Design a protein around this ligand. Structure first.
Ligand SMILES: Nc1nc2c(ncn2[C@@H]2O[C@H](COP(=O)(O)OP(=O)(O)O)[C@@H](O)[C@H]2O)c(=O)[nH]1
Ligand SMILES: Nc1nc2c(ncn2[C@@H]2O[C@H](COP(=O)(O)OP(=O)(O)O)[C@@H](O)[C@H]2O)c(=O)[nH]1
Ligand SMILES: O=C1NC(=O)[C@@]2(N1)O[C@H](COP(=O)(O)O)[C@@H](O)[C@H]2O
Ligand SMILES: O=C1NC(=O)[C@@]2(N1)O[C@H](COP(=O)(O)O)[C@@H](O)[C@H]2O
Ligand SMILES: O=CN(O)CC(=O)O
Ligand SMILES: O=CN(O)CC(=O)O
Ligand SMILES: O=P([O-])([O-])O
Ligand SMILES: O=P([O-])([O-])O
Ligand SMILES: [Mg+2]
Ligand SMILES: [Mg+2]
Lengths: 431, 431
């Protein structure tokens, strides 16, 4: 189908970037519809590494127009920052990237607040990336936030910003007893890049409407993961945006009926970065092994990711929430060497019940326990394989099992960070 | 199609309630996915009137299960308030209504803030309904808000609420120099209804997933209108929720691919309640006539609604944003008697250009001017007609024209507030 969606089923870091970059070969457009620069999508072409945050994972391709949709919270500083680095490496970002005037702007004070709010939580801190995503989303919904479009008139922008910062500073100064952000400094840093910024503006909805009617291949690239959804995730240990497929339509302007394929990116095991429920979490040799073998560190904060077995109970929440058409099974290779591999098939509630559905808010996950199905591991190397034939029967079995347990076909299998260490079995652009 | 969406194309008050109540005859479920009690949907059966706010417009039917989806901001006070009134009238609300534990809770302090924030805007006040929708949405996205589920543990709820209210009161007291809301009073009022509240909780996503696989007829009922969308509307003179079709999926948990039909409710003319751009606004006899003839007053605040001609430019923004499958043309009857009726076909930008697309943020709408197409009015009565044959050729022409100008069929035509003064031409449940 023309419109293909690529999002994280678990808790982010499944490998969305890599799959976006590999599938965009046929795409005219790639659109990030939510998140900000908390995302850290790692691309790897012939070993050259690139971790993108704010800029879409289609940038390395000239044939693709990279779009930052209205649903994304935009940090002008982060953009220039990533833009230049990409430019020095021969990526004419500016020549291939478009923006939404609706995009709310993340400015320094948003990080002051995000910082303040996290400390104030003490032991109960979310584990935010520190980029100010939340405060930006807050101001948005509040209707006091500034968006890309406010830059069209620098005089009124300065006025608007003044009020905003005043309000924000009152609280940072008085309630939090925090260091106040300087208005003049924010105004200057921003105006220094406004033209560049505004130069990339496009009417993203209308674009997608016409690109749609034309039959063009659009790829929407997600940020974070399903269980981090502001609504459906382990609230409040979530991200402030709708990481679920519904976000595609709200964060871009493309009507919901135009989604043709939702590919759920699914890692061979599970990880979490930040605080929050994790039934299948491993704190043993296997835990460290999974970490070590899969270089599980934040592509944005460098924090150690928590590791655990693949959770089928929670993945099926992802299935229904997202309208998955298929899964792309990533990082199978990291499982090589393990004698047995486990997959949680059910949850044992603290009251005794065996359930196969998941809790919602974090509190409701407290004493929940995982029930596994233990399958044979494999000795063979999986890394770099691009043909099921190269996969040992155990792995194939493990793949079939996941499919059985979910009722969704694993259309793509990834065997390495490199764009080429993958096997596409069914290409979403054909379905 | 099984899953039918009914939302406001313009600026709310198009007649969503009436159409939900009329189409639910075949529905097993009706789901409100966004908004709160700012909505005021008026139903009218054999002249008996009912204006619903928070409770879905399927309530008057026993065969229908009414759902308040996660995307809705829930005011426990408003619920009990509406619940009892409905009950005294023989509507066993409790026996037919379900809720989401994800639903954020709107509590008294949210109204203090919404009040404070509006005055602080002075001349630039949004024109909020005063129900505290925004602050509730803010806290949500902020990750400090309380949701229905927090009630499962009253002790931790009280703790949580305490912190929350402390934080909120600091600002109401110090920054705004406003009256502080009393913690104890909020705690008590709330706990008095928690059990009733929690008694209606259901896992809405999973419900919809199974109801979906079963082939059941679901109806999603929208609140407000398309140009009030937090992202795509005339920001900041908008509502804090995603009134666009993308909201259905984010505010319920039903995967985006499961929408089968999006019926855009379209009024025969235009109205706005609150501040904000309105190209076709009428301040003349026609303006007052439209007001008078269509009893254009807020079904929630009783404010006088602003009236204007039907705007085709903005309606087409609604078309693409929403994936409209069809329009339900409402309040044609109110046009009876007019010598000529106008419909804006284009916008004259303040720089001279003729455009047929719309601006985004409110500021960008400033000097914009409407270009009309003037059509013949009609003398005949339209009110109560349920057969196109009863519609005079002028009206039919006016209908064809709207269709020509949009490329979307007017599947339903409404000729009165009563459920029966309507003609369904194509029933969304069949498409
Ligand atoms: N070993 C291995 N690494 C992979 C594979 N796919 C992606 N990676 C690496 O897995 C990590 C995915 O992390 P991250 O980039 O945070 O994922 P994203 O946030 O979804 O794009 C990166 O460090 C990638 O280079 C794979 O199939 N095998
Ligand atoms: N005259 C007339 N009134 C209608 C018609 N459809 C609905 N109404 C009235 O139009 C108004 C719609 O206002 P509101 O209820 O705020 O619309 P909603 O918010 O979309 O449900 C109500 O007062 C209805 O009783 C119609 O076709 N003709
Ligand atoms: O990109 C992200 N991955 C996360 O899990 C995370 N953000 O989502 C949650 C919210 O933080 P933020 O506001 O930085 O997205 C945190 O657990 C944080 O680590
Ligand atoms: O139900 C509503 N209809 C509106 O237009 C409105 N709310 O949307 C905007 C935001 O107010 P609220 O926060 O009350 O929805 C206001 O113009 C308000 O009138
Ligand atoms: O790739 C995204 N990371 O998990 C964010 C971080 O490093 O915190
Ligand atoms: O029907 C909804 N109204 O327009 C809200 C109000 O009265 O303000
Ligand atoms: O990286 P991420 O997962 O998107 O945040
Ligand atoms: O009444 P509404 O339009 O939904 O708010
Ligand atoms: Mg990442
Ligand atoms: Mg109304």
């Amino acid at each position: 189908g023309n419109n293909v969606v690529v999002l994280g089923t678990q808790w982010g870091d499944e490998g969305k970037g890599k799959i976006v970059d590999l599938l965009t070969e046929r795409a005219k457009y790639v659109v990030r519809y939510q998140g900000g620069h908390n995302a850290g999508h790692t691309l790897v072409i012939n070993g050259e590494k690139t971790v993108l945050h704010l800029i879409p994972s289609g940038i390395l391709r000239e044939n693709v127009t990279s779009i930052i949709g209205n649903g994304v919270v935009l940090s002008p500083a982060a953009l220039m920052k990533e833009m230049k680095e990409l430019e020095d490496r021969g990526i004419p970002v500016r020549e291939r990237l478009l923006l939404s005037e609706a995009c709310p702007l993340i400015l320094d004070y948003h990080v002051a607040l995000d910082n303040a709010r996290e400390k104030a939580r003490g032991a109960k801190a979310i584990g935010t990336t520190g980029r100010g995503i939340g405060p930006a989303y807050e101001d948005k919904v509040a209707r006091r936030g500034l968006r890309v479009g406010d830059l069209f008139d620098k005089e009124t922008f300065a006025e608007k910003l003044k009020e905003v910062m005043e309000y924000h500073n009152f609280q940072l100064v008085n309630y939090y007893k925090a260091e106040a952000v300087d208005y003049q400094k924010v105004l200057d840093d921003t105006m220094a890049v406004a033209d560049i910024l505004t130069s990339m503006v496009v009417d993203v909805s209308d674009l997608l409407d016409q690109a749609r009617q034309r039959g063009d291949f659009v790829m929407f690239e997600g940020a974070q993961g399903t269980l981090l959804d502001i609504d459906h995730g382990t609230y409040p240990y979530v991200t402030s945006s709708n990481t679920t497929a519904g976000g595609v339509a709200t964060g871009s302007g493309l009507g919901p009926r135009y989604v043709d394929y939702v590919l759920g990116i699914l890692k061979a095991y599970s990880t979490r970065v930040g605080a929050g429920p994790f039934p299948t979490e491993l704190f043993d040799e296997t835990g460290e092994f999974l970490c070590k073998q899969g270089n599980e560190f934040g592509a944005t904060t460098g924090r150690r990711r928590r590791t655990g077995w693949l959770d089928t109970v929670a993945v099926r929440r992802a299935v229904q929430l997202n309208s998955l058409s298929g899964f792309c099974l990533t990082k199978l290779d990291v499982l090589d060497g393990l004698k047995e591999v486990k997959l949680c098939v059910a949850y044992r509630m603290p009251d005794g019940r065996e359930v196969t559905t998941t809790p919602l808010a974090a509190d409701d996950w407290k004493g929940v326990e995982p029930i596994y199905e233990t399958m044979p591991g494999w000795s063979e190397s999986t890394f770099g394989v691009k043909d099921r034939s190269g996969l040992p029967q155990a792995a194939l079995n493990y793949i079939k099992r996941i499919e059985e347990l979910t009722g969704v076909p694993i259309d793509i299998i990834s065997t390495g960070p490199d764009r080429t260490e993958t096997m596409i079995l069914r290409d979403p652009f054909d379905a």
